[PDB]
Paper text:
In the second case, we selected the influenza HA trimer as another specimen for testing. The pursuit of a very high-resolution structure of the influenza HA trimer by cryo-EM has suffered greatly from the strong preferential orientation effect with a majority top-view orientation, which was believed to be induced by the air–water interface. The corresponding Rosenthal–Henderson B-factor is 185.6 Å2. With the [name] film, we determined the high-resolution cryo-EM structures of catalase and influenza HA trimer, both of which had a severe preferential orientation problem using the conventional cryo-vitrification protocol.
To solve this bottleneck, we developed a cryo-EM support film using 2D crystals of hydrophobin [name]. The hydrophilic side of the [name] film adsorbs protein particles via electrostatic interactions and sequesters them from the air-water interface, allowing the formation of sufficiently thin ice for high-quality data collection. In addition, we found that the [name] film adsorbs protein particles via electrostatic interactions and that the particle orientation distribution can be regulated by adjusting the pH.
Author numbering:
A (entry chain B), B (entry chain C), C (entry chain A): 9 to 325, 334 to 501
């Protein structure tokens, strides 16, 4: 008699469509989504130290807004700026505001050391009713509003050496009165001047005595400037008037700190990736949640979905083999044998080829993508004002990055799916070729992916063929007799 | 007797060389140029609304140059800025000119709403002989040149609330007189000041009273500034002098609008992609025409040609099959059979494998590159002045983008050509293996991509082999007798 | 009798692990490092014109520091800016210093043409003891310190037309005296003003009368500004006072020039690639030395090693063929035959398949990566100050470029290694299939990448099989008799 041993691969009834280099949409047994398209809606407070700016802007906490005194000496890995954040202090503008916000966020600390600045001949601790600290007028806690003492405002000329071994951030301000009457009343000089300089840098501000929109009852402003005094350098403040002096310096730092605009609530949970939408799992290589990211985050891509073939071609369902169709009834392994001999039909999965395919597919993605791009401080990617050239450059850089990484994701997923499908096909063909080699002249490929063994092949001989210990010479005579006679 | 059945693939005499991962220049039956290296030289006026700035710069049309009154209330999807554009009005400079040009181009409209600004104690509608609107002195139509009324220039202090639901762009200016005599004659104050501010922003400009190069007969200038008033915000203009006030505001839009410097004529034609060279077709995924693009444009690459293999190998031309040579004489399909039997030689293309290869090759490039990157406003990529850091950053960002996308194009073309070649080879080999399987023991492969069938194979039998309905058992006895006896 | 003919591939005892798309670490016979991870520590003075700024900053050489007069009229392709560079002249700051440094580096020349500027009513060649040119007081050699002549400082008003065909760079300065007494003594005007303008540009600077840190004995500063005068344009300098006028112009160039901050000594050596680490060989496509590069440099990648498989899979060691193991003892070629016949065992490498594999592998890398991205002037990539938005954008652009190119290198190496391994496997399989085709029915594949030929196969017959001139019909009768009888 003649037995019919042959090979096949597992098939699933519910396949999943993936995109390859050669096929637009090919069904495979298994696939995994490589894009994190959803977020939990909350920012995890671990492992990063998240500082929620409930009603406070980062610059508001920096200056010492009366409603931002809880953020004094605060440190963060990510400062979260809520859209409800508002200023309740003296109206102010920060020329080059974005740079100050960026560098204070990167510093990651509001640690403020008060310094013994000596202001002779002027009244310190000038307050306002726009800045109401308690039941009375106040001002920014980190800024000293100096005004004329008596009937004269001398030329303040103070020095502060940076004898420490770290950069000192001095946040000072220039008062812009609404009228010349206010300018003279606060500062006997009809036109003030504030030159804050270091041995290498310099910033001169001429106060602007002009009316402007009422903000919290004031048509005067404070223009906020910052001076970074590196170690060994010295800060000289020379003011003829309109000086909102610094009460000290902020300890600048370098690290993984940044700032995020987000309304996502902070939740007791752990996630190394934070987006304005909330924290997302970084298990997947790519995301479609937000281009704004903090921590170990997946690369942002424009694709909502990128399915990676983690299985083989799905060819759902006479024991014809892989060339005809896949085997739905085989669950022990990926590739296996079905045999029909005198002892009845049987099946047995091939563990060697199954494990080869599984091992090859296991780390396919993780070996072409670095562990995870861990980004902490970045450029601004959403803007509320129309700034122009610099904002356009930031938007263009981010769009270029997004387009290039989205193309990388598309090409990589197509390449990896093509390689997975070709690899599973090659494993099936390799097992078929091994079986053919074992069955040198004792079998014949029926053409449906199925061999026809021309000798009585009991289950023991089937097992011998399956495990590679099949000796063709034993049955060569009988097989040849049944084949060519 | 016996028969011959050789399997082959179509070949063309006029092959085309392509680049693959494995071969530097491999000849293929067909290839398509993937780089749009040429342009029609004229900008299509569809589907985008192209506004040709014949003799006007965008800022010239914005300010209301007398020779640019045809651009009043103008809208555009692309503003074309001719190199012959010139200014014929009061000489002016725009501090951060690039930013204003960028944001006005992005806004995409010159829609100007005149507002009831009230300037008390000053003479309005000041004009100069440099701006000759008609037979007399004129000025920018969108700017009001305020001067002293009689012998006094009071402290102008006006407000304009933004009660609408859109951003208001206020283009104002500061007059820079040639001499103190002119400053006092126009503005009794010896030193003017223009503070234009919102509840959040502020811009105070001190006029510069100094002579400078004559431009249209004037050594005075206008420094042009813009204020964007968001909805609910209020614009306050406080001028001690030298105020070139706004006559209103330009309504700000957000959309696909931009500006292009181009001398390409406008043509009654349709093209979704516009370059300074002119409109180019976006059928190809890459273009080597211009890095400056607008609309649904191909990605810019440094390659002047990237041929993508849309066919298979050429092995140009005893009927040996694919292993030996390609078949020049087969035009019906890509793969086919040539048979020699007692009834004479014949040929027949294999439609199944041909269609498989054609379908696999049809969308190879499409299923790895997004439809088309539709970019509307971008960074400036060509610069006429040496600005320095920001211009260097823009040039670096564009050069990095160009290099990365050029590498992407090289790698993609090489990968897709390698896959096309391997795919056509695999189709040929799969057809050969199918024919082998059908001819289990009836035929022997002669090594030239062909089979020697050892039984009388009439045209009906050859057709049965070709269509897969060949029964080996019918001729097994005769074939074995002719083979082994 | 019979014979054995096993096909195999060369193996090396010391393989090298490379990385593929399918295997994390696969041993190949040969691999080459694609990342230049090391530098010679010195800057080659060829082929680039390296100018070593020993103790001079580029701006120090530009202004004409007394200790930088050796750099007058100097030209360079790369200006090397040592960390020991110091200023020994009048203390100064350059508002927008980075832009001036960038544009002077891009120009690549300090060629200074002295111009006949006429300053009437002021004292020229003003000096200080901060700039000691010799034993007496000095000043910047390219700047004229103008002061009051006698007891009056008239309103300087000079013009300089650009009648040449090149851009003229005018480096001027504004004096910032420490006290009003110094301002009046040097400049009778209590408040100076310096307006330097062209027909299209304008820079007006108000001198800053305020004290500041002593630098070389002076609490006064020079604010350095530059004006680029296009051909046909004219430069007008007006000054009430505080004018550090230009003595001429620096001739602008466009080309391959740039500036590098490096302490690597310049050595008599040739290298087209320069890094702050020193010159590196550009033979490899990628580097891990420095993201800051000049000349034809390898792309910077984060990977310190990327091994590209320049050989085949290594399978180190009855003459079983390729299926079992690789051939350690075969050095003549890559693929070969080992035969056992009545005349004894022998071996012979296959030159055709070996050469096919070698030719395909030779240029795999260089037909997908452009020769060398020759980058000369680009953005600053290392910053000593915390500047903010623009510096953050530069850092983000460079980090994006580095990440994208590192992913490109990783994916490219994985793809090329996968293709090389599949290529060598396919060459071995193609040799096996050719040998099978030649031995139509005279040999049987034993399953170990080897054939049992069932006829007397002397060395001549084995050579005929190896060179493709083997006629199966000669031995078909004997082989069939030995096979099936
Ligand atoms: C836009 C603006 O400036 N509004 C203020 C207004 O709130 C205030 O009541 C009034 C009194 O002087 O001055 C003005
Ligand atoms: C470069 C420049 O300023 N040129 C002008 C010139 O055109 C004019 O004729 C002259 C009369 O004042 O003044 C000067
Ligand atoms: C930081 C600073 O300004 N230091 C200087 C100091 O070197 C000098 O001796 C002194 C004399 O006026 O003036 C002050
Ligand atoms: C902040 O830290 C400084 C550091 O010494 C300390 O002097 C100061 O009292 C602290 N203030 C607050 C509010 O924590
Ligand atoms: C201002 O202070 C600096 C150092 O703080 C000093 O060198 C200078 O003499 C002072 N000037 C006056 C006028 O006091
Ligand atoms: C995240 O937020 C942005 C902006 O609010 C929004 O455009 C995007 O759709 C959000 N994505 C998810 C997944 O919530
Ligand atoms: C522009 O539109 C406004 C809208 O009211 C109108 O008042 C004005 O006259 C228009 N100008 C032109 C030139 O069409
Ligand atoms: C200027 O106008 C603002 C409102 O526009 C007003 O609050 C302020 O009192 C005015 N100032 C003077 C001096 O009239
Ligand atoms: C397009 O124009 C640019 C600049 O004028 C030129 O460098 C380039 O060669 C042009 N290309 C084509 C295809 O016309
Ligand atoms: C620099 O070149 C100019 C060009 O004429 C020349 O006049 C000047 O003397 C040169 N100076 C030096 C120091 O070489
Ligand atoms: C200043 O010089 C310019 C030419 O450079 C001239 O047109 C103008 O009249 C001069 N002004 C005075 C006040 O001399
Ligand atoms: C090159 O120098 C940089 C900065 O000093 C350093 O981080 C890097 O490790 C150096 N690389 C080599 C190869 O010396
Ligand atoms: O912003 C509105 C407020 O402006 C200010 C004062 O005039 C108030 O009386 C008024 O309510
Ligand atoms: O630009 C040249 C012109 O300059 C101005 C006047 O002085 C004219 O007379 C002269 O022709
Ligand atoms: O920087 C220190 C120097 O400052 C200045 C003078 O006061 C010197 O006497 C002093 O040594």
């Amino acid at each position: 008699s003649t037995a019919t041993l042959c090979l096949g691969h597992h098939a699933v009834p519910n396949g999943t469509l993936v995109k390859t280099i050669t096929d637009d949409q090919i069904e495979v047994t298994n696939a995994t989504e490589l894009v994190q398209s959803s977020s939990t809606g909350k920012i995890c407070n671990n492992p990063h130290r998240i500082l929620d700016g409930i009603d406070c802007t980062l610059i508001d906490a920096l200056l010492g807004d009366p409603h931002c005194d809880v953020f004094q000496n605060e440190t963060w890995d990510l400062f979260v700026e809520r859209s409800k954040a508002f200023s309740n202090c003296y109206p102010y503008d920060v020329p080059d505001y974005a740079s100050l916000r960026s560098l204070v966020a990167s510093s990651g600390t509001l640690e403020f050391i008060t310094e013994g600045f000596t202001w002779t001949g002027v009244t310190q601790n000038g307050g306002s009713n726009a800045c109401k600290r308690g039941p009375g007028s106040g001002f920014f806690s980190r800024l000293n509003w100096l005004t004329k003492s008596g009937s004269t405002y001398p030329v303040l000329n103070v020095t502060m050496p940076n004898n420490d071994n770290f950069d000192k951030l001095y946040i000072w301000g220039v008062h812009h009165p609404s009228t010349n009457q206010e300018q003279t009343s606060l500062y006997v000089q009809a036109s003030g001047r504030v030159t804050v300089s270091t041995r290498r840098s310099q910033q001169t501000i001429i106060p602007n005595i002009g009316s402007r929109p009422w903000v919290r009852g004031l048509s005067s402003r404070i223009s906020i400037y910052w001076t970074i005094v590196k170690p060994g350098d010295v800060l000289v403040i020379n003011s003829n008037g309109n000086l909102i002096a610094p009460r000290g310096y902020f300890k600048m730092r370098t690290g993984k700190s940044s700032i995020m605009r987000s309304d996502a609530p902070i939740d007791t949970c752990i996630s190394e990736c934070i987006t304005p939408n909330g924290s997302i799992p970084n298990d997947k290589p790519f995301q479609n949640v937000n281009k704004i990211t903090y921590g170990a985050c997946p690369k942002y891509v424009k694709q909502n979905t990128l399915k990676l073939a983690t299985g083989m071609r799905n060819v759902p369902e006479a024991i014809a083999g892989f060339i005809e169709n896949g085997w739905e009834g085989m669950i022990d392994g990926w590739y296996g044998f079905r045999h029909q001999n005198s002892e009845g039909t049987g099946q047995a999965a091939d563990l060697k080829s199954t494990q080869a395919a599984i091992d090859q597919i296991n780390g396919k993605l993780n070996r072409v993508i670095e562990k995870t791009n861990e980004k902490f401080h970045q450029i601004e990617k959403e803007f509320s004002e129309v700034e122009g050239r610099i904002q356009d450059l930031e938007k263009y850089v981010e769009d270029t990055k997004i387009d290039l990484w989205s193309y990388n994701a598309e090409l990589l997923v197509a390449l990896e799916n093509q390689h997975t499908i070709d690899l599973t096909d090659s494993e099936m063909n390799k097992l078929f070729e091994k079986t053919r080699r074992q069955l040198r002249e004792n079998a014949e490929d029926m053409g449906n992916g199925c061999f026809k063994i021309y000798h009585k092949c009991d289950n023991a001989c089937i097992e011998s063929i399956r495990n590679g210990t099949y000796d063709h010479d034993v049955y060569r005579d009988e097989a040849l007799n049944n084949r060519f006679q």
